[PDB]
């Protein structure tokens, strides 16, 4: 009893102190500038072929080579412009949530509810892709999967944890701990030195790779959190969950700044992504439709919806010049 | 720059020479989503027709199944990815009144699901032979568990296995009842819950499941050609 | 942060009365169903009861059955559960529980080991 009222005290002291910081709101400040407006977006291209549907895209550093994972068993890698599957690498687990791309583009990720994370090489004398490594350890799902660097990769699970792996050992060089719900999706930061996850309790939560400790806790959904990503800056990061909501956080002021709901909208969100400039929050809702939220004036700027089904990909360029979306009709979309 | 764009160009119709191929393969298979609790016969269904994985064959038709066993209690969000499957097939063991409760609930959440309610549910309540023994011993009452059995009886269209005490029929279609009352509360006509009466040591729920999901395919495509 | 803080409970004779309430906080209240889930000793958790959005639709558990009465109170963002003509077997640590997803008739919320969306309960023992 004493070590919940100790808690409690704590927990009342930090609203205390973010109530404190919470001088002004975000939108208030943000009245000024102008808005940018109806935005809108066509499909340039529809990148097609996939047998089901899709659950992760990820694009490569060079912002032409994307990599897409789907149920049917596949891991296509397409040349953005052409339209042309560069590679088509068969999965050994058909339930994939999650791919990666690596930003020297040697590597692939794969994972999801088989519990392992298979990295693949793609520049290799013998022509076809091969296997290059396997990551097992995890004993849950895999929902997320980033390459910081040729050899650490970060791996989110839904048992509530998180993992660094070195991939030349195979071994899991660190682990991250603390949650209490599924970690559903993280992100590395563009300084690649920290990294958030958001996670079924309606928590995010910041994480230091080297450290390999909680360093900053931050709650205020009400439901599963399904999306997360860094602002371009990487000082704030932006959350979509089951309740139809987006919430933005920013890592220093440890607290919420915007919140993006309507009240036509109940379907939950499952996935965001950032523009470059983090002008734009592209969030991928289950009403088969894409939206995009101004992050200053949290009002809708346009809907993506070309999709028969709900989508589950959302991906931006490194250079901003394309976004793509994929959808469980099985359709990558770009939209330029 | 011509050579490498031609190269990029034969490339590419090896590969979707190998999706056309990969598709084939694909369209042919069908998935399933086997979906239970513990002391509910799912290893037992999966083994008797011979993990993560389950391969069988029923008329040349492959199906797949799934028992997704390595994961947490928690199962909305995995449960998520079974949605272009053919069937969920839902093992439950109904000699158990304690865990059945749960075991409705269960059910009525996979039936009201978003992203369950077009995918049909082959309930099979296993372990009739322990609800059987359990309610000729008399020590457990349903009723303590279910007042309303005691205001059931049986439907005249139940067709009981020939010598068979009448109280065992009528709970087992109490039961089977029950679920398919969560059935037909909200089913729409989308999808259809085929409640079968299994044991441990029966050889025939393949064919069950073959037939089940052939009757889902026809009524898909009666659905497309807009028939029904 | 989402709380479920319970009140009442205690001790009470077989065939008492209680009313056990939970004021929730941290989200919407009236857009998702809620859940009476009780933990008896030496077993799991169990679901006792349910109540949806409106309140329209309620469901109790077959033991629990017209002893035991579900009430949602929008406006005080909270659920009572009362129980009377208690038993022995009614003593346990009771929970109330919100179903993960809002404007929907389906969730899972018996997990055994943890449900981050549940209360912290209450001691009900019947002695």
């Known amino acids: 009893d004493q070590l919940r009222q100790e808690a409690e005290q704590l927990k009342n002291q930090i609203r205390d102190a973010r109530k404190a910081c919470a001088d002004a709101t975000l939108s208030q400040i943000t009245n000024n500038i102008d808005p940018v407006g109806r935005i809108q977006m066509r499909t340039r291209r529809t990148l097609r072929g996939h047998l089901a549907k899709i659950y992760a895209m990820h694009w490569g550093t060079d912002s032409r080579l994307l990599v897409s994972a789907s149920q049917d068993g596949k891991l296509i890698i397409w040349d953005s412009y052409t339209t042309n599957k560069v590679h088509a690498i068969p999965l050994r687990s058909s339930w994939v949530m999650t791919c990666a791309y690596a930003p020297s583009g040697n590597y692939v990720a794969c994972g999801g509810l088989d519990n392992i994370c298979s990295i693949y090489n793609l520049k290799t004398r013998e022509g076809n892709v091969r296997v290059s490594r396997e990551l097992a350890g995890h004993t849950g799902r895999l929902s997320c999967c980033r390459f910081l660097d040729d050899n650490q990769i970060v791996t989110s699970s839904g048992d509530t944890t998180c993992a660094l792996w070195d991939i030349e050992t195979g071994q899991q060089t660190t682990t991250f701990t603390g949650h209490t719900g599924d970690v559903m999706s993280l992100s590395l930061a563009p300084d690649t030195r920290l990294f958030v996850s958001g996670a079924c309790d309606a928590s995010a939560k910041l994480w230091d790779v080297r450290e390999g400790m909680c360093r900053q806790t931050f709650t205020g959904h009400e439901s599963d959190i399904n999306a997360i990503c860094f602002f371009p800056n990487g000082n704030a990061f932006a959350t979509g969950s089951d309740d139809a909501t987006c919430r933005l956080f920013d890592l220093r002021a440890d607290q919420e700044l915007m919140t993006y709901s309507h009240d036509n909208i109940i379907c939950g969100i499952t996935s965001v992504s950032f523009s470059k400039s983090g002008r734009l929050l592209l969030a991928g809702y289950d009403d088969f439709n894409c939206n995009v939220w101004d992050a200053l004036k949290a009002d809708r700027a346009g809907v993506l919806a070309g999709h028969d089904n709900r989508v589950s990909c959302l991906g931006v360029t490194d250079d901003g010049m394309a976004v793509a979306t994929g959808s469980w009709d099985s359709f990558l979309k770009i939209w330029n | 720059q011509r050579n490498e764009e031609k190269a990029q160009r034969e490339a590419n119709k090896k590969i979707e020479k190998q999706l056309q191929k990969d598709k084939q393969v694909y369209r042919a298979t069908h998935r399933l989503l086997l979906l239970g609790a513990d002391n509910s016969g799912k290893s037992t269904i999966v083994k008797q027709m011979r993990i993560f994985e389950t391969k069988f064959q029923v008329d040349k038709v492959n199906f797949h199944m799934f028992d997704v066993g390595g994961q947490r209690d928690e199962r909305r969000k995995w449960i998520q990815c079974f949605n272009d499957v053919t069937a969920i097939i839902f093992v439950v063991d109904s000699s158990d009144y304690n865990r059945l409760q749960e075991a409705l609930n269960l059910f009525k959440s996979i039936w009201n699901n978003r992203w369950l309610r077009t995918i049909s549910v082959i309930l099979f309540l296993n372990k009739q032979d322990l609800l059987a023994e359990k309610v000729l011993a008399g020590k457990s009452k349903i009723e303590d568990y279910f007042p309303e059995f005691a205001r059931y009886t049986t439907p005249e269209d139940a067709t009981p296995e020939p010598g068979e005490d009448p109280r065992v029929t009528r709970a087992k279609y109490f039961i089977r009842d029950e679920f398919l009352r969560i059935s037909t509360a909200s089913g729409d006509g989308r999808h259809y819950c085929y409640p079968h009466f299994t044991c441990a040591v029966d050889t025939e729920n393949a064919r069950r499941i073959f037939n089940d999901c052939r009757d889902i395919i026809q009524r898909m495509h009666l659905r497309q050609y807009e028939l029904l | 942060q989402v709380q479920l803080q319970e009140s009442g409970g205690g001790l009470v004779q077989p065939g008492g009365s209680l009313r056990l309430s939970c004021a929730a906080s941290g989200f919407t209240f009236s857009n998702y169903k809620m859940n009476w889930v009780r933990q008896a000793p030496g077993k799991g958790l169990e679901w006792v009861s349910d109540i949806s959005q409106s309140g329209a639709s309620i469901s109790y558990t077959g033991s629990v059955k017209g002893r035991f009465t579900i009430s949602r109170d929008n406006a005080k963002n909270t659920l009572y559960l009362q129980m009377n003509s208690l038993k022995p077997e009614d003593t346990a640590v009771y929970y109330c529980?919100?179903?993960?997803?809002?404007?929907?008739?389906?969730?899972?919320?018996?997990?055994?080991?943890?449900?981050?969306?549940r209360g912290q309960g209450t001691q009900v023992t019947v002695s």
């Open positions: 529980a919100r179903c993960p997803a809002p404007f929907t008739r389906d969730c899972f919320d018996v997990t055994s080991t943890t449900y981050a969306y």
